[PDB]
């Protein structure tokens, strides 16, 4: 997670402990064509072709949110170090040049195999907002994403 934002950008990170093996948590996150497996905001996702670096997916999010759609490109997928990186290239949201890095690491939680998930991001600060407003907004969504990933991963154990 070597993120270092310019002056017109902001950056932060969130973490979450999952009581599930790494291979189980990784099997959900790594499926770039179906983020709705664990993301509670995604209603529909379309992605053409084979999953590879440069693959682009189109996401439609449910109502109640500031945006309705997003276009995202897969920038990195390491099936050995468990690294996933995604960059937002389009949509109707206010997260321009958003780039995120998600990593999964093994650990022992309550005497059983567990998982630590870390997700950091860099994004432009939209006009009319501050770095801590933007960070607060993105952190709220990411914690909701990771909490749903934890509950889905822990129902598969």
């Amino acid at each position: 997670h070597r993120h270092e934002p310019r002056d017109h950008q902001c950056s932060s990170a969130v973490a979450k402990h999952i009581k599930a093996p790494v291979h189980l948590v990784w099997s959900l996150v790594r499926r770039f064509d179906q983020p709705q497996l664990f993301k509670p905001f995604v209603s529909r996702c379309e992605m053409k072709g084979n999953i590879e670096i440069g693959s682009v997916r189109e996401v439609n999010v449910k109502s109640g949110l500031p945006a309705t759609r997003s276009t995202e490109r897969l920038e990195l997928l390491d099936d050995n170090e468990h690294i996933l990186s995604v960059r937002f290239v389009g949509g109707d949201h206010r997260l321009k040049n958003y780039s995120s890095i998600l990593t999964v690491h093994p650990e022992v939680i309550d005497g059983r195999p567990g998982t630590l998930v870390i997700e950091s991001f860099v994004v432009d600060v939209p006009e009319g907002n501050t770095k801590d407003e933007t960070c607060y907004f993105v952190e709220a969504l990411l914690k909701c994403n990771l909490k749903s990933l934890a509950e889905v991963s822990e129902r598969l154990v």
């Binding site: 109502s63 109640g64 939209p126 969504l141």
Partner: protein, 301 residues
């Protein structure tokens, strides 16, 4: 029998997440919540034993899905009806009472109970269910109107609105729970929350309202606490308009009331139904691409 009409459409939105309820004779209101025991004992009548029929009208604007709004349509009137029946028995052994405080109390606990059922924190019904109704990011507004022959009791939660036409003038019976409202803003920031201008003022930059049923992730910033108002009826009362923001985003209270008096002057009632259908199709002409749900209740005899 009540006099009402209900119109609802998906509109230009992709799917339908609005819900509406209209239950005639859903409960009997304890008259101890509208008159003191002393007031009726002076005429020999027992306030504990009197029965007054009431009807429930409700509009539920869901977000993140339609399941919380659909649940409110089926459960709110059932939970409130059972609460009013049990409250009517408990005011038999209790002396004088603060009627509007008990009105706030019975509606707050009713909304909190449906919220607790939605979140899976309590069990619900022959089969019992205990897991949450839906995901952490689904919620719904709730504007509810208890209508009887003498009073109109209003409970509001969210950015839906109910407006009363009295004297050929609209009177708003509910204040929208927008997060930039100065009491709602102060309340949210008091507990460490943020109200962020992000395509409109939003709780945490996310939800465009400060109160709703469900949305358990955004707690304790978004609460299901309703604002209750008791409104005695009068002859000047023309009609009641319950509607989601699909109408109030393009039609003002005065424009809605004027249109909802001329269609009426000219099972549901065809007159009130014509006002609801016209108000709904007025919102579709004024540049509204959201779901539209309008309930028009006629208050003249």
């Amino acid at each position: 029998a009540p006099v009402w009409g209900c119109a609802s459409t998906r509109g230009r939105s992709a799917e339908m997440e609005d819900a509406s309820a209209a239950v005639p004779r859903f409960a009997d209101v304890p008259v101890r919540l509208l008159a003191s025991r002393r007031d009726l004992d002076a005429l020999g009548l027992d306030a504990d034993a009197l029965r007054l029929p009431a009807h429930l009208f409700g509009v539920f604007d869901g977000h993140g899905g339609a399941e919380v709004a659909n649940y409110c349509r089926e459960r709110i009137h059932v939970v409130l009806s059972a609460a009013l029946a049990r409250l009517g028995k408990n005011l038999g052994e209790m002396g004088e009472v603060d009627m509007k405080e008990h009105w706030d109390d019975v509606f707050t606990k009713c909304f909190q109970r449906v919220d607790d059922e939605v979140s899976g924190r309590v069990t619900r019904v022959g089969e019992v269910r205990s897991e949450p109704v839906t995901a952490e990011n689904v919620g719904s507004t709730a504007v509810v109107a208890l209508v009887c022959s003498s009073h109109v009791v209003v409970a509001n939660c969210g950015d839906s609105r109910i407006v009363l036409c009295r004297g050929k003038e609209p009177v708003a019976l509910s204040i929208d729970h927008k997060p930039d409202r100065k009491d709602e803003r102060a309340r949210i920031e008091a507990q460490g929350g943020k109200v962020i201008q992000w395509n409109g003022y939003r709780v945490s930059g996310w939800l465009a309202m400060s109160r709703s049923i469900g949305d358990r992730y955004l707690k304790p910033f978004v609460i299901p606490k309703p604002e209750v108002m008791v409104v005695p009826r009068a002859k000047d009362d023309d009609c009641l308009i319950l509607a989601s923001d699909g109408l109030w985003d393009v039609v003002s209270n005065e424009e809605a009331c004027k249109v909802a008096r001329r269609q009426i002057l000219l099972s549901t009632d065809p007159a009130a139904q014509a006002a609801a259908d016209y108000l709904m199709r007025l919102a579709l002409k004024k540049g509204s691409e959201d779901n539209i749900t309008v309930i028009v209740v006629d208050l003249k005899p």
